Amino acid sequence: AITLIFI
Amino acid sequence: MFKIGSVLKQIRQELNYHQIDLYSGIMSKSVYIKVEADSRPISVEELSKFSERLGVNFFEILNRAGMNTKSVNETGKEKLLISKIFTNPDLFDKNFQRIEPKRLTSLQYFSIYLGYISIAHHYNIEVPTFNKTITSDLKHLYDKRTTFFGIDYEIVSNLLNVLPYEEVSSIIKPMYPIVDSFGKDYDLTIQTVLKNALTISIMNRNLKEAQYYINQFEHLKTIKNISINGYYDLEINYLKQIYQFLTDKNIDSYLNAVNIINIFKIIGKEDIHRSLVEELTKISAK
Amino acid sequence: MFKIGSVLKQIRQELNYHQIDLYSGIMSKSVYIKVEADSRPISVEELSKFSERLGVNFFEILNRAGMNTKSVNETGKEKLLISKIFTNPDLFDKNFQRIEPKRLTSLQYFSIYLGYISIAHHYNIEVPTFNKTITSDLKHLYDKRTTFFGIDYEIVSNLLNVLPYEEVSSIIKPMYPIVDSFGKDYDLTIQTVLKNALTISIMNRNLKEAQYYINQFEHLKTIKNISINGYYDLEINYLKQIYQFLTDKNIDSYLNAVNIINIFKIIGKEDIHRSLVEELTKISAKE
Amino acid sequence: MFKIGSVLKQIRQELNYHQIDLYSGIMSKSVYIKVEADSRPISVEELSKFSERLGVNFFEILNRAGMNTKSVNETGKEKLLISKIFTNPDLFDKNFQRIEPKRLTSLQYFSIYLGYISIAHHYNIEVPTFNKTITSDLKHLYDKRTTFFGIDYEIVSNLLNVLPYEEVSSIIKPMYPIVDSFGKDYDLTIQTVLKNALTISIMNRNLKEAQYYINQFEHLKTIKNISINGYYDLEINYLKQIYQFLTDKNIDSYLNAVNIINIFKIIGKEDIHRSLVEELTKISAKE
Amino acid sequence: MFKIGSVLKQIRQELNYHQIDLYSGIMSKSVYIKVEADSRPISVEELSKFSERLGVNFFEILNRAGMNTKSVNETGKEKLLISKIFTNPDLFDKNFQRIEPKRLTSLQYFSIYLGYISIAHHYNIEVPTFNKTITSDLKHLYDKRTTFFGIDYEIVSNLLNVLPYEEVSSIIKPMYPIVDSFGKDYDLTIQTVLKNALTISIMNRNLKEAQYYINQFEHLKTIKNISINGYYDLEINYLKQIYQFLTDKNIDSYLNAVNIINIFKIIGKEDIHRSLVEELTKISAK
C-alpha cells in the first residue's frame, strides 16, 4: 500500500 | 506554554516525594517553587534531572505536560486540519490558498502542502500551480542536502504519493541506507518510505528497485535501538513474498503472501486487509 | 550534559537558516550564540520554539542531542548492564550486591532489581533476599498509589515474570483500564503487561482473567493517539484465538491461532515463532 | 558460623579482583567458589593468604566476618549480660544461679562469675556462697599455673575488685614482669591490673607495693610491639605523682597530679575525672 | 605456616585439660591429634571453638601462634625494612627499584611505596618517577572505590605526608564519617588520618577543614566498640585548643593547649613533646 504520513 | 511544573508537582506528590527531594542540589527552594508554580521556565537539563529523581520517564513527563497532540504549534493544527479537509473537500480552497503560498517556509509546511495536493488528486481538483512547480520546489529543497531528518522521509512518503516514481527516485537514493535511530517517530517515517516505495516498485514491476527497498528494510533490523513497526514488517514481508513470486515464480511465495494478507483480516486490520486484497488482485494483472 | 545547541546549529545550517531566523523574537543574538555554543542551558519552552522554526521534530532533536540511549544517566547504564549479565551469569554477584540494596531507591531501580531476580531464576542462582522481601517491597511501593506511570507497568511486567500470578494480580487490577496515552514508551509498557498477563492466564487456564486482559487490550485500540504494537496485536490475537478454542472448542479458532504462529515464522520473527510453538505444544497439555 | 567467604567476595569485588586472583595457586576454581559461597570451611592458613592477596588486614577481615562482638559464643553473651544486670539488679538472682554453678568451667566463666560478685557487692546483695569458696577457687585455679593469658589478667583485675588486696597479691606477683606482647587485648588487660593494683596500693598507703606496680608498668613501655593505653598512661602517671608526693613530700608532684586530673576533665573523660577527684579528696585523708 | 596446633596443646596443658575436652563434639581423637601435631590445617571455625573451650582469647592464640610480627609474609618484611632504610638512606636505591615497580600490586604495596617516597623527601633524594605518576596512581586506585579498609586510611595518612593537602583532600572526604569499628588496627588508622589531616589544616590555617576533622574525630567517640587512642585524644585535643585560639582568640585555649603539651613531657612522650613545641612555636608565626 502507498501510505501518507503526517507527524 | 506547557505546564511542566504542575506535572512535576503532580508526579512528585503521587510518589510522595518532598520538594526537597527534587530541588536538593539543583536549585533553591524558592526557585523550585517557581518552577512548580510554572512561573519559571525550566531547562531541558533541569527537567532531565527531576526526571531521574522522580523515577518517571522524561519523555513521558513532557507528553503529560502537553507535547503530545500537534496543537502545540501552528504547523500542528495545519496537519490535523488536513484529514478534516480530506473528508470535507469543500474546505480545500479556503485553506489551500493560505498554505500553498508558504509551502517552502519549512520542511513541515512543504509536507502539509503535499498533503493538500494529495487530497486534490483524490477528488480530481484543479492544481495547475503544483504541476508548474514541484520540480523546481524539490530542486530548491534537496539540491544541496547531505543529512536527512524525519520530516524529510515524511516528505518523500507523501511525494511518492502525488508524483511519478521516476520523479521521486533521485531524491530517495541518497537518503539510504540508515545508520542510526533517532527516535520512534524517525524510525517510523524511514520505514514508511520503504513500504510505499517497495509497493510502488512491485506495482510497476521494477524488480530491481523492489529488490533494493527490501534490502534497505532488512538492513534497518540490524540497527541498534531501531523500532521496527510490526504492521510494516508484515506488509513489507508480503511484498517480499510477491517479489519472490514475480521472480522465482515460486508457488509457495504466493501462498505465504496470501497467508499474510489473511492475518491482517484476522487481527482486525480491515483497512490494510482490503488494500492488500485489491493490491493482489491488481498484481495478478497490471 | 547534552549538546542541544550544536544539534540546533547543525539543523539550522543544513536547512540554510540564519541565526536570526531562530532567535528573532526569542532572545538576543549574543545569547542565542551562547545557546548554539552550548554554553547556555536552553529551556524546554525555548527548544520547543526553535523546533517549530526549524520545521524539525522536537523529540527528534532531543534524540539527536543524546536523549536516546539510556547511557544518559546511571539508571540507564544499570539497565543496559542487565542483558550483559543475562548472558554472562558470573557477573551477577558483583552487581547484584550494589543494586539489591537500593532496589527501593526509585521505580527505575526496583525494575532493574527485578531484572537481576529474573536472571537468577533463569540460572537457578540463590536469592534468599528476594523471597524474604518482595511481598513487603510491593506493599511499600503500591499500597497507597493512585496513578500509574510507564515504569509502573514495566515493573508489573517483570513482576509477572518472577512471581506467581496470584501475588501480582492484586497490583494489576487497579492499573486498568487505560484512559489516555502518554507517548510511545508508555503505550508500549501498558501493552506488554496485558500480553504477559494474558499469556499467563491462558497457560494456567484462568479463562475469566484471560477474558479480562483481552478486553483491556481491545479497549486500548479505542484510545486517541494510542500506538498499538503490531507484533503484540498479532501475539495477543493468537492468544484470543486459543482462548476461544479453550471455551467454544471452535476448530476454526485453533486454525487461526496456527496461522498467526505461522506468520511470525514467515516475516522472520523466529524467536517469537519458537515461543508460540512451544507455547501451543504446551497448551495442548499442561504447564 | 561466620560468613568469611562473603566478606572475601565483598572485598574482592570492591578492589576489582577476579576470583582467579584469590585462588590461583591455592585451590581449584570450583573449591574457591565454595569458599566464597560460604559452603566450605576455610583454613586459617588459606584466609591468611587471601588476606595478603586482597591487601586488606587479616584481623580486619575476621572482624568484618563477625568475630567482633562477644555474641560469637555463649561466654560472650554472659559477659554482655553483666552490664545489663549491673543497672537492673533485680535480674541478678535468675542468672547468678546458672553462672555460679559453672564458675570453674573455664577461665572465661570464672571471670563472669566475679562479674556477678562485683554487682552484689555494689548493691549489698547476699553472696554467702562466694565468701565460703573464693580462697578454695583461687587455689584450684592458680596453684599449679606457670604461664598466664589475657583472661588471667582480666580475672585478677576483677579479683582485686571484690577481695582484700592481701588475698590477691600472692596471685599477682608471679604474673609479672611481662616479657612479650600477645595482641591489643592482652596488652590491655595486663595494664589494667597494674592500674587497679597501683590505685589500691596508693589508697592503702602500701608504698612498697605502689613502687612495684609503677616499675612493672614502666617496664611494659620497653616491650617490642606493646600497645600502651594512653588513658592508662595518664592515670597511672597521676598515681606515680601522688606516690612521689606521699614519699618525697614534693609540692611539685601534687601539682602535676592535679594537672593530669584536670586534663581528663578537659578532653572530656568525665567519669575518669570524677573518679580521680574523689580519689584525690580521699587521699588527702584515708582509704 | 603457623604452629597453631602446638599453641593449642601448650595452653591445653597449662590449664590441665585433656585432648577429649577440646575435640569432644568437634572431631575424632585421631584427627585432633593431627591438629595438635600441626599436621592438619585447622579451620577458623574449629579454632574458634577450641578457643571457647580453653577459655583463652581467640586473637591471643593466633598471636601466640605467630600472626603478630609482620614477618608472616612478604609485605610484612618490606614494611619492617622501611624504618631500616629511614636511618640508613644508602639502602634506598637497591630496594626502591624492586618496590616502585609493584607499587600498584596491592593496597599494601602502595603504602610501602609511599613509605619510600617519604624517606626520599626527608633526605632530598631524587624521585622523578613519583611526581610523574601519583596523580595517575591515586586516580586508578580510588576513582571507583565505595568502601574503605584500614590499609586505605593508612595510605591516606602517608599520602598526606608526601603531597600537598589539596591533592589529597578529594580522596579523604568520601572516607568519612566512620560508622563502624573493625578492630583496634582499623580504629587506629582512621584516627591517624584525622590527627595528621587536622594538624596540616591548622598549620595551613584552613580553619574550615580543621573544624571538619575535629567533628569527625568527635563522632568516632560515639561509635560502639571504637577504641579511641589516648595519646591521639590528647594531641587532637591540643589541636582543637589551638583551633579555638585561632578563632575565638580565647586566651584560655592557648593556656590549655600549653598544658596538654606539658603533659606529654610529664608522662615521658618526649618525641611528641618536641613535636608539639616546635609545632606551637611555628603556629605563633607561619
mmCIF file of C-alpha atoms in Angstrom, chain E residues 21-202:
data_model
loop_
_atom_site.group_PDB
_atom_site.id
_atom_site.type_symbol
_atom_site.label_atom_id
_atom_site.label_comp_id
_atom_site.label_asym_id
_atom_site.label_seq_id
_atom_site.Cartn_x
_atom_site.Cartn_y
_atom_site.Cartn_z
ATOM 1 C CA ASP E 21 37.972 -31.671 76.366
ATOM 2 C CA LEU E 22 38.990 -29.990 73.108
ATOM 3 C CA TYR E 23 37.904 -32.389 70.352
ATOM 4 C CA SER E 24 34.793 -33.817 72.003
ATOM 5 C CA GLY E 25 31.966 -32.987 69.630
ATOM 6 C CA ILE E 26 34.218 -31.346 67.054
ATOM 7 C CA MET E 27 36.446 -34.065 65.578
ATOM 8 C CA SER E 28 37.866 -37.559 66.054
ATOM 9 C CA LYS E 29 40.572 -38.149 68.618
ATOM 10 C CA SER E 30 42.897 -39.177 65.798
ATOM 11 C CA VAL E 31 42.205 -36.041 63.756
ATOM 12 C CA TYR E 32 42.569 -33.663 66.697
ATOM 13 C CA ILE E 33 45.902 -35.361 67.361
ATOM 14 C CA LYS E 34 46.930 -34.341 63.849
ATOM 15 C CA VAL E 35 45.774 -30.793 64.621
ATOM 16 C CA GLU E 36 47.937 -30.542 67.749
ATOM 17 C CA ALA E 37 50.722 -32.229 65.803
ATOM 18 C CA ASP E 38 50.362 -29.334 63.354
ATOM 19 C CA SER E 39 49.965 -31.903 60.585
ATOM 20 C CA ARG E 40 46.420 -30.843 59.738
ATOM 21 C CA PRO E 41 45.337 -27.325 58.776
ATOM 22 C CA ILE E 42 42.747 -26.123 61.267
ATOM 23 C CA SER E 43 39.658 -24.158 60.208
ATOM 24 C CA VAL E 44 38.887 -20.715 61.534
ATOM 25 C CA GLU E 45 35.617 -22.150 62.860
ATOM 26 C CA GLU E 46 37.351 -25.044 64.632
ATOM 27 C CA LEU E 47 39.950 -22.741 66.149
ATOM 28 C CA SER E 48 37.129 -20.516 67.325
ATOM 29 C CA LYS E 49 35.560 -23.417 69.193
ATOM 30 C CA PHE E 50 38.789 -24.717 70.797
ATOM 31 C CA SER E 51 39.248 -21.116 71.839
ATOM 32 C CA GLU E 52 35.948 -21.097 73.748
ATOM 33 C CA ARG E 53 36.866 -24.473 75.236
ATOM 34 C CA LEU E 54 40.240 -23.294 76.525
ATOM 35 C CA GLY E 55 38.733 -20.056 77.823
ATOM 36 C CA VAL E 56 41.578 -18.162 76.194
ATOM 37 C CA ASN E 57 41.127 -15.348 73.659
ATOM 38 C CA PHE E 58 40.981 -16.433 70.019
ATOM 39 C CA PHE E 59 43.009 -13.498 68.788
ATOM 40 C CA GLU E 60 45.513 -14.041 71.598
ATOM 41 C CA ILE E 61 46.011 -17.620 70.451
ATOM 42 C CA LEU E 62 46.575 -16.529 66.864
ATOM 43 C CA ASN E 63 49.141 -14.024 68.076
ATOM 44 C CA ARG E 64 50.859 -16.671 70.167
ATOM 45 C CA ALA E 65 50.981 -18.847 67.028
ATOM 46 C CA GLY E 66 52.822 -16.214 65.005
ATOM 47 C CA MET E 67 50.301 -13.775 63.493
ATOM 48 C CA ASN E 68 51.997 -10.940 65.387
ATOM 49 C CA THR E 69 55.107 -9.560 63.655
ATOM 50 C CA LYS E 70 54.623 -8.617 60.011
ATOM 51 C CA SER E 71 57.226 -11.250 59.067
ATOM 52 C CA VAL E 72 54.212 -13.500 58.427
ATOM 53 C CA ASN E 73 54.538 -12.574 54.734
ATOM 54 C CA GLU E 74 56.496 -10.587 52.142
ATOM 55 C CA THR E 75 54.557 -7.378 52.564
ATOM 56 C CA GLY E 76 55.413 -7.544 56.258
ATOM 57 C CA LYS E 77 59.159 -7.706 55.655
ATOM 58 C CA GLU E 78 59.029 -4.870 53.158
ATOM 59 C CA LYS E 79 57.315 -2.741 55.781
ATOM 60 C CA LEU E 80 59.800 -3.535 58.560
ATOM 61 C CA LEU E 81 62.570 -2.821 56.060
ATOM 62 C CA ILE E 82 61.375 0.778 55.630
ATOM 63 C CA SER E 83 62.304 2.089 59.105
ATOM 64 C CA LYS E 84 65.660 0.422 58.482
ATOM 65 C CA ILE E 85 66.221 2.378 55.266
ATOM 66 C CA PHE E 86 64.934 5.508 57.008
ATOM 67 C CA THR E 87 68.018 5.535 59.235
ATOM 68 C CA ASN E 88 70.301 4.001 56.573
ATOM 69 C CA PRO E 89 69.479 6.071 53.447
ATOM 70 C CA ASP E 90 72.220 4.408 51.366
ATOM 71 C CA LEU E 91 69.924 1.370 51.359
ATOM 72 C CA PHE E 92 67.119 3.164 49.473
ATOM 73 C CA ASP E 93 68.117 2.746 45.808
ATOM 74 C CA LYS E 94 68.575 -1.031 45.951
ATOM 75 C CA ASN E 95 65.067 -1.663 47.305
ATOM 76 C CA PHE E 96 63.172 1.273 45.783
ATOM 77 C CA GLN E 97 63.830 -0.302 42.367
ATOM 78 C CA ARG E 98 62.107 -3.526 43.405
ATOM 79 C CA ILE E 99 59.232 -1.807 45.218
ATOM 80 C CA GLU E 100 58.430 1.133 42.907
ATOM 81 C CA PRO E 101 57.611 -1.244 40.004
ATOM 82 C CA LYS E 102 54.975 -3.078 42.040
ATOM 83 C CA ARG E 103 53.531 -0.112 43.950
ATOM 84 C CA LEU E 104 50.111 -0.855 42.460
ATOM 85 C CA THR E 105 50.250 -4.603 43.153
ATOM 86 C CA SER E 106 48.095 -4.339 46.308
ATOM 87 C CA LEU E 107 46.998 -1.613 48.713
ATOM 88 C CA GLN E 108 49.728 -2.936 50.990
ATOM 89 C CA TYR E 109 52.416 -2.362 48.409
ATOM 90 C CA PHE E 110 51.236 1.113 47.508
ATOM 91 C CA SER E 111 51.524 2.019 51.191
ATOM 92 C CA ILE E 112 55.090 0.718 51.311
ATOM 93 C CA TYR E 113 55.859 2.646 48.120
ATOM 94 C CA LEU E 114 54.642 5.850 49.777
ATOM 95 C CA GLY E 115 56.940 4.809 52.600
ATOM 96 C CA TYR E 116 59.991 5.044 50.371
ATOM 97 C CA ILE E 117 58.780 8.308 48.893
ATOM 98 C CA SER E 118 58.607 9.626 52.465
ATOM 99 C CA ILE E 119 62.250 8.725 53.062
ATOM 100 C CA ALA E 120 63.495 10.375 49.881
ATOM 101 C CA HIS E 121 61.573 13.581 50.620
ATOM 102 C CA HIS E 122 63.252 13.649 54.047
ATOM 103 C CA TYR E 123 66.778 13.256 52.688
ATOM 104 C CA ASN E 124 66.074 15.108 49.427
ATOM 105 C CA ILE E 125 66.684 12.109 47.167
ATOM 106 C CA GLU E 126 65.564 12.209 43.559
ATOM 107 C CA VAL E 127 62.165 10.659 42.851
ATOM 108 C CA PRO E 128 61.201 11.911 39.369
ATOM 109 C CA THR E 129 59.080 8.796 38.931
ATOM 110 C CA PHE E 130 56.809 9.752 41.849
ATOM 111 C CA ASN E 131 55.968 13.283 40.675
ATOM 112 C CA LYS E 132 55.171 11.972 37.223
ATOM 113 C CA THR E 133 52.652 9.409 38.493
ATOM 114 C CA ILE E 134 50.909 9.737 41.894
ATOM 115 C CA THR E 135 48.071 11.735 40.353
ATOM 116 C CA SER E 136 47.533 8.865 37.920
ATOM 117 C CA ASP E 137 48.149 6.253 40.629
ATOM 118 C CA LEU E 138 45.571 7.740 43.008
ATOM 119 C CA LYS E 139 43.064 8.101 40.193
ATOM 120 C CA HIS E 140 43.496 4.428 39.346
ATOM 121 C CA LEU E 141 43.378 3.396 43.000
ATOM 122 C CA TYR E 142 40.355 5.349 44.222
ATOM 123 C CA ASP E 143 38.310 6.574 41.253
ATOM 124 C CA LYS E 144 35.693 3.870 41.634
ATOM 125 C CA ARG E 145 36.008 2.995 45.332
ATOM 126 C CA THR E 146 32.976 2.915 47.639
ATOM 127 C CA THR E 147 34.061 1.141 50.838
ATOM 128 C CA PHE E 148 37.338 1.606 52.671
ATOM 129 C CA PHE E 149 39.548 -0.652 54.709
ATOM 130 C CA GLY E 150 42.250 0.066 57.242
ATOM 131 C CA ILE E 151 45.014 -0.025 54.634
ATOM 132 C CA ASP E 152 43.185 2.766 52.771
ATOM 133 C CA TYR E 153 43.330 5.034 55.839
ATOM 134 C CA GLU E 154 46.943 4.011 56.268
ATOM 135 C CA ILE E 155 47.625 5.009 52.660
ATOM 136 C CA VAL E 156 45.891 8.356 53.119
ATOM 137 C CA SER E 157 47.960 9.055 56.233
ATOM 138 C CA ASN E 158 51.185 8.516 54.290
ATOM 139 C CA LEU E 159 49.708 10.322 51.312
ATOM 140 C CA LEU E 160 49.139 13.432 53.483
ATOM 141 C CA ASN E 161 52.820 13.123 54.262
ATOM 142 C CA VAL E 162 54.330 13.361 50.795
ATOM 143 C CA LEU E 163 51.830 15.503 48.899
ATOM 144 C CA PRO E 164 50.133 18.906 49.152
ATOM 145 C CA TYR E 165 46.900 18.721 51.161
ATOM 146 C CA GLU E 166 44.888 19.964 48.155
ATOM 147 C CA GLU E 167 45.949 16.882 46.212
ATOM 148 C CA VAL E 168 44.821 14.526 48.991
ATOM 149 C CA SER E 169 41.610 16.132 50.333
ATOM 150 C CA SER E 170 39.432 14.876 47.445
ATOM 151 C CA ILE E 171 40.348 11.328 48.469
ATOM 152 C CA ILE E 172 39.664 11.828 52.165
ATOM 153 C CA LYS E 173 36.202 13.402 52.207
ATOM 154 C CA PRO E 174 34.428 10.243 50.984
ATOM 155 C CA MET E 175 36.178 8.093 53.601
ATOM 156 C CA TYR E 176 34.299 9.727 56.491
ATOM 157 C CA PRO E 177 32.265 9.648 58.606
ATOM 158 C CA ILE E 178 33.091 6.266 60.099
ATOM 159 C CA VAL E 179 30.038 4.262 61.080
ATOM 160 C CA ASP E 180 31.568 1.080 62.427
ATOM 161 C CA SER E 181 34.623 -0.292 64.129
ATOM 162 C CA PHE E 182 36.536 -3.168 62.587
ATOM 163 C CA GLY E 183 39.181 -3.809 65.196
ATOM 164 C CA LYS E 184 41.944 -1.995 67.035
ATOM 165 C CA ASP E 185 44.148 -1.732 63.932
ATOM 166 C CA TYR E 186 41.268 -0.259 61.924
ATOM 167 C CA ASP E 187 40.270 2.184 64.643
ATOM 168 C CA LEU E 188 43.898 3.244 64.887
ATOM 169 C CA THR E 189 44.480 4.169 61.230
ATOM 170 C CA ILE E 190 41.173 6.013 60.882
ATOM 171 C CA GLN E 191 42.247 8.192 63.834
ATOM 172 C CA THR E 192 45.747 8.752 62.476
ATOM 173 C CA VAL E 193 44.357 10.293 59.276
ATOM 174 C CA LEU E 194 42.270 12.749 61.302
ATOM 175 C CA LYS E 195 45.221 13.613 63.546
ATOM 176 C CA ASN E 196 47.537 14.235 60.573
ATOM 177 C CA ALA E 197 44.883 15.997 58.490
ATOM 178 C CA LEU E 198 43.851 18.263 61.382
ATOM 179 C CA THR E 199 47.493 19.063 62.071
ATOM 180 C CA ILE E 200 48.008 20.085 58.452
ATOM 181 C CA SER E 201 44.770 22.100 58.471
ATOM 182 C CA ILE E 202 45.928 24.081 61.500
#
